[PDB]
Amino acid sequence: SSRNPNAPRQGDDLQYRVNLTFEEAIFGTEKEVKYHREAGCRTCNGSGAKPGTSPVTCGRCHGAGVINVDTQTPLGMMRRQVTCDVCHGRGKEIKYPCTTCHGTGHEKQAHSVHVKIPAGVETGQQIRLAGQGEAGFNGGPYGDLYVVVSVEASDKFEREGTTIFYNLNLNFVQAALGDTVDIPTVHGDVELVIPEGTQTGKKFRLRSKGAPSLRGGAVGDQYVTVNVVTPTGLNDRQKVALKEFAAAGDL
Ligand SMILES: [Zn+2]
Ligand SMILES: [Zn+2]
């Protein structure tokens, strides 16, 4: 959005997709990220000239970057500026460019970054790290680095925001008579008491066993949801107990 062709301009942004485990995301964590950015030659100090040589005033534009283009009218003179045949900038140290960056002041560096992942992130949350990402032009600023969280599934839990979700399979006997089960939690295990008579679908709410909130909130909750499993692959002693169960209870 500026007419000066050699105006300063910010470098390209970068994106890193970082893979987390279910729990890494629930809690905090930290990673070092290794990658190759374009950074700006340390070998030439940013000007693409063999050290001990120098950019020099242009052998056409005479230090202007532009060629005045003057045309005689009846009433006067027309001046058109067109950007220089050669330098397109200011100087012209092209006879001796830096060896590594082939003249443009930008070296492929190897870079590493220390990232605090705050507790509670979900897949697709981004973090902006200001300095990182690619080199600016004509002395402009450095790009930003953007990491997107990508969270791996759990074998036990589903999640959504602060809330954790666990399904409990109960058998008929446990459902009818009640029972006490150990319930997995991202914070460790928790004993839960199942009343006698539990209907399938029942939702139990464990307070503050869910995920920490990004926006300063208190920890969320883990909701346990009961599923009653019909039994299958039943031997004859088992089918007798049930037929005998049926009879006891229509008497
Ligand atoms: Zn260089
Ligand atoms: Zn020139």
UniProtKB/TrEMBL annotation:
Cofactor(s) this protein requires: Zn(2+)
Q: Please verify whether the record's keywords include Glycoprotein.
A: no
What range(s) does the CR-type domain occupy?
28-110
Kindly list the ranges of residues that form CR-type zinc fingers according to the record: 28-110
Task: Establish whether keyword Oxidoreductase is in the entry.
Answer: no
How is the cofactor bound, in the record's words?
Binds 2 Zn(2+) ions per monomer.
Know anything about its domains from the record? Answer: The J domain is necessary and sufficient to stimulate DnaK ATPase activity. Zinc center 1 plays an important role in the autonomous, DnaK-independent chaperone activity of DnaJ. Zinc center 2 is essential for interaction with DnaK and for DnaJ activity.
Q: What does this protein do?
A: Participates actively in the response to hyperosmotic and heat shock by preventing the aggregation of stress-denatured proteins and by disaggregating proteins, also in an autonomous, DnaK-independent fashion. Unfolded proteins bind initially to DnaJ; upon interaction with the DnaJ-bound protein, DnaK hydrolyzes its bound ATP, resulting in the formation of a stable complex. GrpE releases ADP from DnaK; ATP binding to DnaK triggers the release of the substrate protein, thus completing the reaction cycle.
Q: What is this protein called?
A: Chaperone protein DnaJ
What is the gene called? dnaJ
